[PDB]
């Protein structure tokens, strides 16, 4: 349980989006959440190198409660682009 929020908790609202298509746009992820949510910014790895994973992005949400929202979206697949439940959490707790 929380008691109060932290400034650094806002940093952690980001959602790691893995399993993505080689040819996804940055917007394809922000759209996919905007239907139920609000986006702060879009930190898509510029996946053009043609030799790495080719299926990753990090979307900054504006809201803590959209992290467990985004988890619940794992089994959709826009054009063939599902998302992992992973979140962009950290190996830290107080």
From Swiss-Prot:
Domain RRM, first and last residues per copy: 13-90
Cysteines engaged in disulfide bonds, as pairs: none
Known tissue expression: Widely expressed. Highly expressed in pancreas, skeletal muscle, lung and brain. Expressed at intermediate level in kidney, liver and heart.
Residue numbers of Phosphothreonine PTMs: 6
Localisation: Nucleus speckle
The protein's role, per its UniProt record: RNA-binding protein that acts as a pre-mRNA splicing factor. Acts by promoting exon inclusion via regulation of exon cassette splicing. Also acts as a transcriptional coactivator for steroid nuclear receptors ESR1/ER-alpha and ESR2/ER-beta, and JUN/AP-1, independently of the pre-mRNA splicing factor activity.
Family note: Belongs to the splicing factor SR family.
Subunit structure as annotated in this protein's UniProt entry: Interacts with NCOA6 and JUN. Interacts with ESR1 and ESR2, in the presence of estradiol (E2). Interacts with RSRC1 (via Arg/Ser-rich domain). Interacts with SF3B1. Interacts with ZNF106 (via N-terminus).
Additional observations: Antibodies against RBM39 are present in sera from a patient with hepatocellular carcinoma who developed several autoantibodies.
Identification of the protein by name: RNA-binding protein 39
């Amino acid at each position: 349980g929380h008691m109060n929020l932290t400034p650094e908790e806002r940093d952690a609202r980001t959602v790691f989006c893995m399993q993505l298509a080689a040819r996804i746009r940055p917007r394809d992820l922000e759209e996919f959440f905007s239907t139920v949510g609000k986006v702060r910014d879009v930190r898509m790895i510029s996946d053009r190198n043609s030799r790495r994973s080719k299926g990753i992005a990090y979307v900054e949400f504006v809201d803590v409660s959209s992290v467990p929202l985004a988890i619940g979206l794992t089994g959709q697949r826009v054009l063939g682009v599902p998302i992992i439940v992973q979140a962009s959490q950290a190996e830290k707790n107080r």
